[PDB]
């Protein structure tokens, strides 16, 4: 079964070239009600839905090791984004779909990974990014990678304006190859949904 | 537990020897155990 | 009277790896709970088995490629955790801290060519005993080997067997050993069809019976 | 074994595929708690010193393995060679407290002092990397095991007890230029 | 022979908080009885919960007062055991000897106006995350808050909740932290009727789950 | 009792280690336990 | 209080043969299996009983020979583990490391002549008590002795008995003892027929009750 | 086992005191026990 439909709230995504879903580090969330929020946290399901971001253009000239990253959360102009401005503390996991649409006559390979506590990796460390939750996108096989990760961090709730626990990373493993019948470049997009969104500590209004 | 090999108990109580954990799981062991082995397809051995 | 004891010469000095514990001084500390924190690993080899990491070929590429459709040796490397090709792998990163190992090492080959590119490859394990590795698939056929072609499944995995005189082998390599003590792995392309710019990505992981023993602290500090 | 590489599902083939037999393995030496449980040097010292495991050497056995994890937890043992009395204060204490006897203070007894200390951070686990700031690169100041002070601190060894590691990160061997193998002098009998 | 022992290096030194006892030298002393002596306390927090002590506002007054009947911020203070306003309280006197705390802190408000003076007040807990505390009841309404008016019962008590990223917070405050790490408490007067010279006395006590841990000896001696 | 954590007994008898109390009570614990909580009046939650 | 102990003078020094064990420092080492490795020996005397080794006669020959067919003393040697004739034997090689012994020592005689050569021999044990060993079979006949002739079975074995005043004898020989303390063994040829160039090979092994006691390290080092 | 004579156990566990043998026999004892004794032939004692 290569055809998968994912639903997050009133948004869905259907892909006919998937290689399944990779769960990173766990298949469930730690407890969302601990001592640090004194039972004042609440869940906001209206934020649990897909938002979109263009990551980069995969062109033939990008060599092995070329890396593009997106720290999460990112700027969000919807419900999730308003939560970041209205509550002091939050926690959520991520449901991540990355697509790279060219055609089956393209060759090459991208590594898609979710990295906790991002730090710039040296060139030698790039050979080991598969230690992190990941999938590959290779035109001969799939156009979509799908990874699901839980919230984590030294603190049970976080202040996202000060710390970003997860970073989506896309790295060229083998360069994009082109033919007379292939696409000439592939635009890479992310379709991301925050999961199990909890907030605590309502803030005053700015005016 | 770890690199210790005294056959005899510790002279001190555990509440002193270590911090005590409270409650409110080996992911990589599960991941490795779940690996596929063998082949795929049809064998002619 | 009281108990007479012999304070014994040669005992009592601090040894950095001793199996005893220190006397405590600050009691009753309760920790914040960390029940079910994700991503825990309790043995380095669980991680090494589950997460293959990339080999390093000429020019720092995790793959081999060939432009000719003729049969050719694409790569040859020492079966050594200290091999140049293994130097950026997690398996070698762990192995440097142990003096010895035994067991299976698994190689993974992932073809990344377009749908219209096809190839047939061969991997052979060449034990110690010959001066130089075989340069053709025909000479290497007499060794333990596997051949496979590309298709719907892009990945092929092969176990490099532990075959040696002693039960364990050294993880490091000595300045005196010229040809590798554990042999070589040779990767050949039997032939290909329209696969000139297409690559074969290679990675390595620990096998089921891979084992490391005798912890050491060898790096310059 | 043949599979879909893109899915990234773990696959562990064995020698049985071509007629061999998988052997027994004994992995006690790569057990996490066991391997981290030994003393290592801290090295950059001052008479007032905040205990931070990230000050272990990055290529040392313990320092490298610690950096190969994102989060960790452990209790601690320390061996300190010092002049004067040694005082320790927990995570969060004002530096000024190091001057007072009411805090755990060890009176000098040659050749050095060995103590067992509990984890005292306010977080459920600590991290070796932290992607963000802690003020209203570096690690938050709260990532420590307390601080010690003596007239002079000559040497400091730390030992992680009942260690737990989470979320593996890259661990590198020395880079090789030889084009074949990194070679070095392995111990061998004289004459 | 006798028992051989290893006198171990690194052990045996005196540690001021050690968990062992000294050898005795003067036995059989019987004490005068002190059965049921009154006023015993066995835990500092029982006292801290039961006996609220006064906050300190501008000019060393344990109360706030306002002469205008308009809505106004009567006081704002850091949720910190090291806050100026808490500096003469028993809770802060105890907290200085511990490095960390978590749990509820209770504020008590007692109106002392005459029978013909009435007022309506509001208290809000403002978490960290904004540059400055809200100056009006309207902006603060979006925070956790309580409003109450004066009447037969002169006292109102409100729990300041523990809401933070970590499970414990530091009792002391560092020179580097500019705005308070735990937020603020803001007390407003919504309005009043003929209450110009009348005051609201404020005191603080430990809540049911308030906890202090990790004893320290920090004062200059 | 207090800050002591030896798992093993004391080598000396209690009549020597400490003074012995004779006979002829936690007030603040009672006081704190007796505190009112909740509200007062009528709730509309 | 804690346990009072008397650190005792005169105890605790290292003794090279002490019966205690050192403190360990590197645990959990599992060894390669060595199940049923062949050729194991657990007691030196099992080897000494089962494997006779050669005596040494004039000119370093493990045999005696005679050209005359008359009766003659072929060899005489001291019953001593330090005897010249025993100096290249395994039994003496082991015995030098013990101060005392008791029990039976077995001598083996193997005739190597051709089929047409015949002889009759005699071996006698001469205890201490006479100035010089008997030079003829007739004088030696009054001692414990055995006579045998050559035939199909080429080997004859004879037990030298332990007969002494004390229960143990010294393995070494002192500079002061002129004639041997334990006596002599004399080997005679009674007569022979056409055996002029034929030899009698002599070897020695430990008997069933041979015993060595009190380990010593005597060689110059 | 060997030259050791403590009546009391070892303070440390065996996994620390010694290496541990694994499995997948006294030849000279058998050889010596098997030796012929007595005579051979016919005795006239």
TrEMBL record, chain A:
- Compartments reported by the entry: Host cytoplasmic vesicle membrane; Host endoplasmic reticulum membrane; Host nucleus; Virion
Q: Report which superkingdom the organism of origin falls in.
A: Viruses
Functional description taken from the UniProt entry: Cysteine protease that generates mature viral proteins from the precursor polyprotein. In addition to its proteolytic activity, binds to viral RNA and thus influences viral genome replication. RNA and substrate bind cooperatively to the protease. Forms an icosahedral capsid of pseudo T=3 symmetry with capsid proteins VP0 and VP3. The capsid is composed of 60 copies of each capsid protein organized in the form of twelve pentamers and encloses the viral positive strand RNA genome. Upon acidifcation in the endosome, dissociates into pentamers.
Q: Which family does it belong to?
A: Belongs to the picornaviruses polyprotein family.
Assembly description: Interacts (via R-G-D motif) with host ITGAV/ITGB6. Interacts with host MAVS; this interaction inhibits binding of host TRAF3 to MAVS, thereby suppressing interferon-mediated responses. Interacts with RNA-dependent RNA polymerase; this interaction allows 3B-3 to act as a primer.
Name the chain's protein.
Genome polyprotein
Recorded source organism is Foot-and-mouth disease virus A
Of the intact sequence, the residues represented are 298 to 504 of 2336
